[PDB]
Amino acid sequence: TTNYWQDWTDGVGTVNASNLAGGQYSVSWTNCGNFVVGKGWSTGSPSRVVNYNAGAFSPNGNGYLSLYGWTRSPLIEYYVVDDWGSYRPTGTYMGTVTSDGGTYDIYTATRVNAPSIDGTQTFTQFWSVRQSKRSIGTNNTITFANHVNAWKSHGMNLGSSWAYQIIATEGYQSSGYANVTVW
Ligand SMILES: O[C@@H]1[C@@H](O)[C@H](O)OC[C@H]1O
Numbered sequence: 001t002t003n004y005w006q007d008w009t010d011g012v013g014t015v016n017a018s019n020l021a022g023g024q025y026s027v028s029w030t031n032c033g034n035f036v037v038g039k040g041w042s043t044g045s046p047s048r049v050v051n052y053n054a055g056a057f058s059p060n061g062n063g064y065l066s067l068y069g070w071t072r073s074p075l076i077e078y079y080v081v082d083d084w085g086s087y088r089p090t091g092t093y094m095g096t097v098t099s100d101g102g103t104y105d106i107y108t109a110t111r112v113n114a115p116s117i118d119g120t121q122t123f124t125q126f127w128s129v130r131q132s133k134r135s136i137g138t139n140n141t142i143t144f145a146n147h148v149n150a151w152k153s154h155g156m157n158l159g160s161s162w163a164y165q166i167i168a169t170e171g172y173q174s175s176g177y178a179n180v181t182v183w
Helices: 144-153
Strands: 004-009 014-019 024-030 034-041 049-072 076-084 092-099 102-114 121-130 140-143 161-182
Touching: 004 014, 004 161, 014 034, 024 034, 034 049, 049 144, 076 102, 076 140, 076 144, 092 144, 102 144, 121 144, 140 144
Parallel strands: 076 121
Antiparallel strands: 004 034, 014 024, 024 161, 034 161, 049 076, 049 140, 049 161, 092 102, 102 121
């Protein structure tokens, strides 16, 4: 079961996040800047099988619902995006991976002197982005090892030191509401 609760915001606008029982959380936001809220594990694993059910995911504008986490050595921010609002995230196309009933586009990107778990840093993003939005309100599995191993085939090797790993609601200059249960 989950062991970790993340409630990060850059403090712009209003983000109200609730650490509910077990693997459940909710977040309501109005005119946010950037925030990343969710539940999962304080140390990620490349072989974790993650399940969630988004009781609600209703961004008004830009928001993502993703498996989300970080490695160090080197510093990598990674995403498996199952749902989004007005904006589908993309980067430099690498290929596709088919997992858990969906097909995902694989992307890389460089973030130059940008916010990170270690402050301002230059780092890399690894993305799997579903080609269509996954159903909301259903029990959804992300078999993360499929993504890790697809990424590996494109030279997208994760770092050797694992930080947190969560099913994250992320907003950017938007408003919305989400309620998610993770296990
Ligand atoms: O963990 C946080 C990360 O999610 C955010 O993107 O930038 C600041 C970090 O503290």
